[PDB]
Amino acid sequence: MERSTRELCLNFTVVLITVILIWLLVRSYQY
Amino acid sequence: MEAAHSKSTEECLAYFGVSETTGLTPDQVKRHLEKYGHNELPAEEGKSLWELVIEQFEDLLVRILLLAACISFVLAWFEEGEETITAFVEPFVILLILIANAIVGVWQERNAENAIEALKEYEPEMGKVYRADRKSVQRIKARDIVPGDIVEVAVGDKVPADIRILSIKSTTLRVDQSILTGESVSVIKHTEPVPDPRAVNQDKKNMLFSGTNIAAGKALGIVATTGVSTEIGKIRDQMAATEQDKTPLQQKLDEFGEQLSKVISLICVAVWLINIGHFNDPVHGGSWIRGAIYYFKIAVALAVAAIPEGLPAVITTCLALGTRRMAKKNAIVRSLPSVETLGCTSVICSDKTGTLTTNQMSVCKMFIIDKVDGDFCSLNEFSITGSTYAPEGEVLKNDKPIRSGQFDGLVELATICALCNDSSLDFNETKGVYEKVGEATETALTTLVEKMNVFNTEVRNLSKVERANACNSVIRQLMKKEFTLEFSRDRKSMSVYCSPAKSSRAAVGNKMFVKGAPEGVIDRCNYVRVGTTRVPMTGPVKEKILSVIKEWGTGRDTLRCLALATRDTPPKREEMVLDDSSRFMEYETDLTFVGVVGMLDPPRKEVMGSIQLCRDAGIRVIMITGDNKGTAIAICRRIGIFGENEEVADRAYTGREFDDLPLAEQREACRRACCFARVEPSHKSKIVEYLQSYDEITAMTGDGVNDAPALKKAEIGIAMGSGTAVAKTASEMVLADDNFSTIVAAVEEGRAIYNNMKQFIRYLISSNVGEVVCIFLTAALGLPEALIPVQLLWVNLVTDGLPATALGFNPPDLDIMDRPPRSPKEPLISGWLFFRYMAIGGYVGAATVGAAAWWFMYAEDGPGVTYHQLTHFMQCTEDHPHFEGLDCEIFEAPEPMTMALSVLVTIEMCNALNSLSENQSLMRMPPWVNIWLLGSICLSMSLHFLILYVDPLPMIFKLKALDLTQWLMVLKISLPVIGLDEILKFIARNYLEG
Amino acid sequence: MEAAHSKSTEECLAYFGVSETTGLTPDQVKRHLEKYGHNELPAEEGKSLWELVIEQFEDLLVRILLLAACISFVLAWFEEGEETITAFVEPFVILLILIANAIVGVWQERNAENAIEALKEYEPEMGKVYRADRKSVQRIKARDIVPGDIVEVAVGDKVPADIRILSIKSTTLRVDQSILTGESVSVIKHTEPVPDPRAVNQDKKNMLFSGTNIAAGKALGIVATTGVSTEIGKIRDQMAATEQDKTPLQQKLDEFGEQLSKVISLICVAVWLINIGHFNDPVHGGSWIRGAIYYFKIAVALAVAAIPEGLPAVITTCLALGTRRMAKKNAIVRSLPSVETLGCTSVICSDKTGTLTTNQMSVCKMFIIDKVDGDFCSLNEFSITGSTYAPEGEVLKNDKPIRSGQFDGLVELATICALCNDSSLDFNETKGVYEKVGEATETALTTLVEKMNVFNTEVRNLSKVERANACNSVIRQLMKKEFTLEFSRDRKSMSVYCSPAKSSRAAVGNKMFVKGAPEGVIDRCNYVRVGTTRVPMTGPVKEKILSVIKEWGTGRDTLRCLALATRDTPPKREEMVLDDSSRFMEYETDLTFVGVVGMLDPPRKEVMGSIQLCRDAGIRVIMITGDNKGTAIAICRRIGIFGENEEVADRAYTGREFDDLPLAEQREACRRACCFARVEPSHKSKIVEYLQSYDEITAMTGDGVNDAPALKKAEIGIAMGSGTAVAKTASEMVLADDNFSTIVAAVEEGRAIYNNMKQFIRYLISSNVGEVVCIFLTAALGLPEALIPVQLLWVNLVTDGLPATALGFNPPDLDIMDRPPRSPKEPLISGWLFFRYMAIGGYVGAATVGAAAWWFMYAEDGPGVTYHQLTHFMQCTEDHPHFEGLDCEIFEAPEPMTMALSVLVTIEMCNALNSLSENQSLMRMPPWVNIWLLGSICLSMSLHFLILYVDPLPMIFKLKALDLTQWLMVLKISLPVIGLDEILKFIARNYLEG
Ligand SMILES: [Mg+2]
Ligand SMILES: [Mg+2]
Ligand SMILES: [Mg+2]
Ligand SMILES: [Mg+2]
Ligand code: NA
Ligand code: NA
């Protein structure tokens, strides 16, 4: 079975997402 | 139902409305299934993603840091309301970095719990029920049992649900209720009703409680209650934490990690203390409030990033992954802590038949008496072709096929085989193959007769199904098997009494047929049948028979052969008492030898090499066989347990011979004994005992009920996948395929797993040491903070996020099975290992602060250039008769910080490659061996460049993108970590071999 | 050049090298043309298609919506990531939709720009230049002017480039530099050099700045700078946003949309707000947070389509396409706000000559004295044939052609005409027609002499060019025009002083020739020439003359006729002072009457009807003419300004008469006056002013310099296309053809455009109120959402995309020119109108949620069928003792959604057909009247069918293709909108007429 690849994608998106929410969140106080 | 013990057997059959012959009907099945539900416990809720993240944010330090970052932001307004942006954004950064650093943890624990759980998937609980579909027994999932259907249980079975005893098929029934009643001793049962309905469990001696074991016998019964209604199900809604023990590895790891936790904390308070003389400084609003807070944050942050967190979790994660791998290879890990032990295995006692061999029983050879004349003794040897239970083959004499029917000796021979049999053949249609119905020994016998056809009966005009027992049927047509004097180990044989079919008034026409070990059967022979005649058993005749038996049992086929005999004048049908086994040998005397069948079950192909592998691994294998001492030794030679020519007189014992030794000598025997033949069930236990008294870690095979004691006794209990449920529950591991080779694989997995755990540890511990020598080296030498809280916690989120978890996919190390078994005494982290940890750790730390100091002291093509006294960077605003064209505000340049970060991260990816093998060079174990890791290195470097080039990010992160030259410097400063560890590896490899 | 003001006249002529007689050479032309560039400003770039798209992607709402559409999806893969397909594609469709939304937006603003800039194409800036090509003046594009060439400017001209004054032809030169200098008063200019080169514009009194007007005079000069080097050019690189005003109508509309916006906001966050007790539904994964997001998406997805964004832009759309049509009908709209006014036009003051008439001047009739005997007085009346300026026609007496040279009176008559003349004729070869060279009045006179030929000179043997001035030349061969005492309105006449040719010693031979209004000319006569004789002027003679003049001026030809007289004994050549006009009448006395020329300029054919059309529109027409009172009234009667018989004693005033009224009486005179004769320039302003005092919207024609003030005062200033550029810059609209009829057409268009503006509004507002009550009705009756966001925004992209824009092609309404002028006071959206918007609006919404309700409550041939309590669909999974064979998951059926959408869309097409006329029935105004809209209907339905039938689509859109029967239900539910509006229309049309 091995959910191996799902493990690297999820840990690539959790640090992708929280960086996207940094671009976003910084600008909602910039304006 | 309710109080089914109080009711009578019929009152129960009635209540549900079913006969103990029909079983349930597909209707009632679906009805009960809906009225009652599946036979199981309620699949518990569990926990939510939301909840676990919250529970993560319950750390003092986590709270502390986050609270102090709120206060220092709330004091970013009062003294000088200047430009903030980043000073507001910091708190929101931290809590998001932390959030994502906790989410990752859930993924780990989910993954952990998952694999562990997913093992039960490999070994589901079954049951024997009678239903409407077919007439015979149907094996099903226990969860698919409806309270009401008829159940059958036998020796070694686990009770699928609460049953009311219908009919005891054996003469006595015994049950191990230990799991519930507590009582170790097996309790007897009956089929009568128990009076008091207000009675207790121990009193319900007509009931069988789900989760109990059948110690001895066979019984029929009707399901009373299932699910939570069960006497066991009503106790599993009691205790939630039915496991409170720590494997001595986690215990030592929680000890070590706790030692770091303490030191890390001290030199974490130290950082906040060696900065008191800077609480007052202007750059902190000139207040002991903001002063003691800008360093308090640094303190708590370092601590949060450097305290080795879920160190126990590393074992949990590692056991998780090992587990699934072992199961993939047909090694079902019952008990988790066992795996740790599995590595340290030093002895394996395996059974021969079925584990070392296939148990694909077939008769190869057989002889009868040809001609006897004083000293002249000729044998009629035959070979039979085809090793499958299939009645397809031929009987050859001197390499030419013959008609066995044309040999009177063979007619009797085949007669005895068909009538001394309790097993038979069955042609499967779905599979399209013939298969056994009873013991393999007896089934091989059945097949023999079907090939011989001593009566030239038809075969080709018979369906594949009728073929199955054709010639056997015929043989039974002639004689009437009256009764059987079954086998006993005390005499090593068995017999049947038979009367002719076509006989009215016969006083002398009854015959006894004997089958058993050659040894004793031959001794109870005074006549040697010659075709149809009979002569006296001379000494020479007995000699010729024996030598051929010896030949075959010692040959390169190591055959297990049986002697066949008849008694022509059997004692009176009445003089015979069919109770005491002690009188059977007395009836089975005054015999006429007929012939001998030699039969074969070949060793598994793999066994040969698997054994060799254990030799290499320094693991002693001990064979335990039911063959005689002769054949037993032969087999050991044949499979490499013994050399071709080496001496074995003191390395192979029979049960008897063992018992004849005094206790001191028996202990002595086990230190070098490799073969045991014809033993008693008790011997397994004693052998283990002795083995333990030498500090050996033992793996012991078993599959029977009387195996349980020794299995529980052993360090690694190994039950056969096809064995008793009693055996399995008492063992720490189950062989899916019953294969000895599998056990050897399992051990290799133990070693391997132990190594991967070391990989993870080295990487975490070392990276954290560096994480601390960094922030301490800057505080000590008074240097400008090379990394700020947000940067450190980010680096933390990447390191312990991608490469670390990608280490979970490290291939097995090399020397793995060329080492002696590890001692379960040796400590986890050795002194050398700790030196290794410090060296590397300390080096990354110094390499980080030196990366920052490179942009100042030795600043090439960049500002600063303050070769000296970069140390005292506080007396810049005030005491500036030392500044030369240098702005004080440069100590806040986003370049040194970007140096530090851009080196620490790179050095971690390097260190990750160092953690492929525990000792083996990257030239002997190339980096592209773990592609997962290599992919993780890419993603990590993706994130770094992005946090540096996407304009909003580098700003809030206090970072500025670096030039190609400075990147080359990063490499020129990181890459020597590979070389350092490489040196250390070469020292650990060539100077400290083990 | 540089600082040409500091340089002398020659220093400039030199610097470029050109004589102020030669002008520039084709070589020098091409050269400077490349060395300097075309005389104009650098065409601005503006922005790019994509660059503006992004700008639209900046809304609070577009952000918020396009955010919580990805927040929702991230909480979809990572919280409970089940089967998604549509869940991922939704956000990636919202943006795709929004992209195609802006594309329409930008397209419309492009089209709005195009029409606007395309107006300057109609009225190109010209210049008068002297060059090498020809000897006379050359009229060219101002852009084709190279700094260096010689420029001539005159009264009423725009200065084409920055010019250095060479030579002032008139006696003084006045210039209106208001536009740059800010000084309102006209400044005098000179040809001398201004000292300081570092001086200011206001001081450069020898310069003429491009963009300025010649207030009075004529001058010659040389171009210094052009393009961006200009003193105006360097200022046009200053302000880009010069639209710092908005019509009181735009505001009245932005105010209304702002109100709706506010209400659309309230009943939008009330939709989400009232939906809290549904945040925890199982289909929401039971999440306060997931529920908030989902309903929060609906709220904002409303706003984005519900709030009317481009209302202020719709006004502009209209004006754009209105202006364009107007210009196509020869009415160039200088001022954009003006169009809105143009509708409300209540009064038009038009000049007669050239605007009401063709100004195709020609002499029809003429008389001279036949015989006088005391009380007997006979006239010699003649008619001339041919109304063209062509010298081709014949002089009849009593319908019989005669030889005019045979009548002495006529000889002198023609002499006076040829010598009291400053104009002449010219035969054009290209056109092959004769054309005037000077004032029409005078040229018509030249034509008369050419037709008469009082000397029987040759004609036929002369080229078509020599014929032009033949006889005229002859008459000049006889007399020598010494000087002329030019015309002054204070005496209504003019004269020349002539000496004979071959005659030196003739102190008694010189004559004075007078021509002017019969009135005063006749009164300064004491003799009446009879052929070659003279007699005294008696009372009866004067009476015969005057009666004939009256007859002609009042007849069905309304001739404007002049009297021709001579002074036989003129005062001495020296006794006369030629400076003061006051002394001229004194000279022109003691005269001999010769004869009278009666001349015609016919009224334009269309004028007649146009006036009628004005009567119908409730718009009053005021004729201003230079004729005497009598003829003026005559003309008015003749063109229908007055009734054939009606009394007009108080509706016609002369300049004089008006001035003799006191101020209060004057104001009174304007309220009913319709004819003004012989007025001063000032009377235009005063008239306007009084008309303003009655709240009239006045249109005022003008063409001369002294017209500017009144043109600026009037609400609609209308300059003639053939007039001074000063009049044009002062006015709001230019008559390409100078046709009075064109003005009327311009007003009609004004009314029409207001209507189309009404159309657009109704449709937009209404459809939107619908789009809201739809989503509020389903949220208030708690129904299963009739529409989802992706559906809504799709409908929005179509509705405000194809039908809405196609309405811009609506033909003009019907009662358009039969009502009285709209008051600029009455509001845009009236009470009745609002009620009309709500009705249709609130209806389509009801019909959309009903369309879904029908698939449930009244569900025919379809599932649901839940007659009641479809309301509480949330308590279906939980409280299901009410369900009867109904799967709860039906509330997410792809059918009720396909109803709502498939209904809303069809009702919008219907509503668009309601928006063909503001009040007129589809039977009075057939739907096949706007083919473009009809075409938009097809395409809109083409997209709808396709989004239901091409498999990828209906899936992503939560839609299933419906059956022909259910389509009939759609119709049976949409089409009653047609009827509803039709009802309301019939109400306004028959009950609230106006
Ligand atoms: Mg760490
Ligand atoms: Mg066995
Ligand atoms: Mg809309
Ligand atoms: Mg005029
Ligand atoms: Na054990
Ligand atoms: Na005006």
From Swiss-Prot, chain A:
It is found in: Sarcoplasmic reticulum membrane; Endoplasmic reticulum membrane. The keyword ATP-binding does not apply. Changing residue 31 to A: Nearly abolishes inhibition of ATP2A1-mediated calcium uptake. It holds the Pfam family Sarcolipin. Its main location: membrane. The keyword Endoplasmic reticulum applies. Residues 27-31 are lumenal. Reversibly inhibits the activity of ATP2A1/SERCA1 and ATP2A2/SERCA2 in sarcoplasmic reticulum by decreasing the apparent affinity of the ATPase for Ca(2+). Also inhibits the activity of ATP2A3/SERCA3. Modulates calcium re-uptake during muscle relaxation and plays an important role in calcium homeostasis in muscle. Required for muscle-based, non-shivering thermogenesis. Homooligomer. Can also form heterooligomers with other sarcoplasmic/endoplasmic reticulum calcium ATPase (SERCA) regulators ARLN, ERLN, PLN and STRIT1/DWORF. Monomer. Interacts with calcium ATPase ATP2A1/SERCA1. Interacts as a monomer with ATP2A2/SERCA2; the interaction decreases ATP2A2 Ca(2+) affinity. Interacts with VMP1; VMP1 competes with PLN and SLN to prevent them from forming an inhibitory complex with ATP2A2. This is Sarcolipin. It comes from Oryctolagus cuniculus. The gene is SLN.
